[PDB]
Every structure is written in structure tokens, then in C-alpha cells.
Write a protein that binds this ligand. Sequence first.
Ligand SMILES: Cn1cc2c(Cl)c(-c3c[nH]c4nc(N5[C@@H]6CC[C@H]5C[C@@H](N)C6)cnc34)ccc2n1
Length: 494
Amino acid sequence: RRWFHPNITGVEAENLLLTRGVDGSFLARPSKSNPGDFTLSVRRNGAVTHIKIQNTGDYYDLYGGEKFATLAELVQYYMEHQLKEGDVIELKYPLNCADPTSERWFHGHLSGKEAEKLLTEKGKHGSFLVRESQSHPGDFVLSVRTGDDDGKSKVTHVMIRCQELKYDVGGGERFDSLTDLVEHYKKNPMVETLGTVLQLKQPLNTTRINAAEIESRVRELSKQGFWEEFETLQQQECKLLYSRKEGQRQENKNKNRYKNILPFDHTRVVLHDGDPNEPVSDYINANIIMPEKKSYIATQGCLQNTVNDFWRMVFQENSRVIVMTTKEVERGKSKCVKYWPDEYALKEYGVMRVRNVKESAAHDYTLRELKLSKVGQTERTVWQYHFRTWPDHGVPSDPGGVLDFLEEVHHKQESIMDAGPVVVHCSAGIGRTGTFIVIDILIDIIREKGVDCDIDVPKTIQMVRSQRSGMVQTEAQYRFIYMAVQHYIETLQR
Ligand SMILES: Cn1cc2c(Cl)c(-c3c[nH]c4nc(N5[C@@H]6CC[C@H]5C[C@@H](N)C6)cnc34)ccc2n1
């Protein structure tokens, strides 16, 4: 993902493309002044075009292009394909960024003893970091722990010289960036004169906190670090380009809200017992999310033609609780089509039958008590929690309403013996959906253990993002997750 440049200006972008690129060269970059705006900058015919990519919380919307779950999936699509102003714009040659500050292992500011302490306390064999030299202004230091799991372990420091914007460990190959240097010694470890192999197995973990000390961390990230932690998470999304072939089948194209926002094959919900008189009846744009007790299905808002599939899914998976994350309509646009009957009414949805027994309004949500059964047979109650007050852009300014909602959703789920996964949906089913599920996982840990458990917010998101594309869309959602955790801890504290 070296084609993303976190700290580049528009003019820097043009200059790089003109001086270091050719026709078909391209890079992506943030706007500083605009929080979820991105720019795809592309060279064509000796000039540079800039293409806006907007993300308000639900998807990356490329101007004159499609909607995507991640910038990595966006770039892969166009590099393997179609993008137009109405002339075609080709993405051929990624223009690679040398900037180290979005790498997990980069801690510019760290001193020598502080890096030793951190590796001593948090680190294990093969834990490493790169820091700026304090003794040699402009050089870097590689600091690596090796040993058993005393004096059976040690920290080694390797000096990294910077000569003419190339990095080296004192001999051999000179690398054009610290990333290229680290990737080379990750793959081909340095061996000390006396045998020790300085293996670079994992970056030092600096994001795992004890839950009690959330307020400390939020304060620090608020000085921001929030943006820096988030971009470092985003850099890792290139590890998550898993196959989505079932969703790409012609038979399944019009079962997807957005043609290119698709379920990973390895976690998609497979529907059995379908209409035998219809070719592909096993597909819904939905994934199982298994925290790595309570599981989830993350899915899109229904289309007219997928409402029947949605109820087949709820019934098959034994789900008893549905969370809806959007109004039916927002900004005059359909965000989640109505798939339930009016209050007191009864409807058939293919082979499934649903009664709406009772609706109950709360401040931030409406609860619908639905009864689901198969025609001709099986009845169970499905409790649908329809969150109604999420703003149309951005995130809520206070997390109390979301937390009070998830607390109630949690207790409903826990009250029903052997209930299946909690269904969480609407819109594309990645942004708000991913935000609600992550908050839910984190608060669950804390509810079971207490204020003195360890959480790792970015680790948790990456784990959920490995099970559905782009779960948690924006920096604002990312910040909102930390705020919700912070707030939960305070209400529990006393
Ligand atoms: C499997 N897995 C993936 C993970 C990722 Cl992506 C992170 C993570 C996200 N953002 C970070 N920011 C970090 N920080 C700031 C400040 C210093 C350090 C480095 C970088 N300069 C940004 C560290 N880890 C992270 C943490 C745990 C993970 N587990």
C-alpha cells in the first residue's frame, strides 16, 4: 500500500508524478482540511488529474467511479480493469511513498532507554521498533528483543545511517526508505558475530491498554495521535484482500447494494434449502463475524429482491436479535428498505412468515417484536432494534445513546437460550455496522472482566476487517469507538 502518501500536499503530489512518475503513475492522499476526503492523483498524457474520493461513514465514493469498501480494494479493482473523467484514466504504476510514520514499528520520538523499557515490559522474542537517533541527528536505530519467551533475553540496537536519503546498517545494500530496509531484514535476518539471529517477528505493541487507563490514552491520542493510529490501521488493509468470488457471480450481481462491496468467500453466510427451481439460491451479501461466545452477522440493507433471502438467513442461523443502524430513508435516499410488516400485521416473505406483534418507541430507537416462522410449519420471536438517531454524516457527538442501546441489545440476546448470531445491518453494512459490532465486542470484554482487562482497539478492528471488507470506515468512527469505551468505563467505574 505504498501508493498512499499520508502527509503530501496537492502540489507535492503533482511534482512527484511529473518528476518521478510517467503516464499511468498514480498515488492516493488525504485532505488535511477535510477529515474523510481523499484524492486519487493520476498522471495521463504528461499532466496530473486529481479525483475526489469521499467517505462520510458508509463507503468510499470515487467521483466518476464506483463505491468501495477500502482504498486497497478500489486500487485493485482499477488496476485489474473503466475509470473515466468521459475519457479513460488508467492506474498503471503506483508511485511509492517512503514516509515511515504509518508503519506499526515506527516510533520516531523514542529514546534509547525508553525503547529498552518498552521492549522489556511489552515485548517478546522478535519484537522490534525503529526510532530516531538522538546522538546522530538524521539517522535511525533498530531496537530488537531476542530470547526465551533470568538474562535469557536481551535488547540489541542496530544503527541505521541515512546517507543521501538512503538507509543502511553500515554495509551492503542502501535502501530508498526505512520500509524497504526493514522488509529486507525481516526476510533475511542479521546474524551477530557470535550467532544470535536478530529476527524481526512482530512490531512492539503500543496500542494494547488496560481498560482502567482509557482516559489517559484518549487524552494523549487527543493531542492528533488519533489520526496517526488510524492511518497505521488503514495501511494494514492490503493484508485483507481476500477473495470475494461468489459475490462477483453474474447470478449474484443484483443481490448486492453496491456492485464492488462484497462478502469475503471464507466468512460469507451460505444459505441452504433454497428454491430448487432457481440456479444460485445460496448467496446473501452478509458475513459471519466471530470475535477472535457472542457472534454477529454483518450485512447490507435489503434490496426489494433480497428481502426473502434476508429472512431465510435469520431463520437458518437462529438469530433472535436484529440491529438496524440507519433510518429507512436518509437525505431523501433509501438506506434500508422496509422488510418487516406494519404493527399488528402479518406478511409472507417467500417461505417465511413474519408477524409484527408490538412496536415500542424509545428515545434513540424503536423496538419491534417480530414472530418468524416457516409457512406450513417453527415460530420464534425476533427482536429488532432500530437505531433512529445516528446523524446523516459523521458520528453521534455523545456515545451514551448507542451504549444504552447496545446494553439493552446485549441483555435481550443473553436472555434467549441458544440464540444465534446478532444480525447487524443497513446501508452497505460496513461503516456504522462495523462501528456497532466493534464497540459491542470491546464492551463485552469489559462487562465480563471489569475495568482491569486489556483492550487493543486497532487489533480488534483488524480482526473484524479480516471477516468483512472495510468494517469501520472512518477516523471519526474510530475516535467514536474509543469515546464509547471511555464512557462505558466511567459509568461502570461507579
Ligand atoms: C494484527 N494487528 C494489526 C494491528 C495494528 Cl494495524 C495496530 C495499530 C494500528 N495503528 C497503530 N498505531 C501504532 N502506533 C502509532 C504511534 C506509534 C505506533 C506506530 C505508528 N507510528 C502509529 C501501533 N500499532 C497500531 C495495532 C495492533 C495490531 N494487530
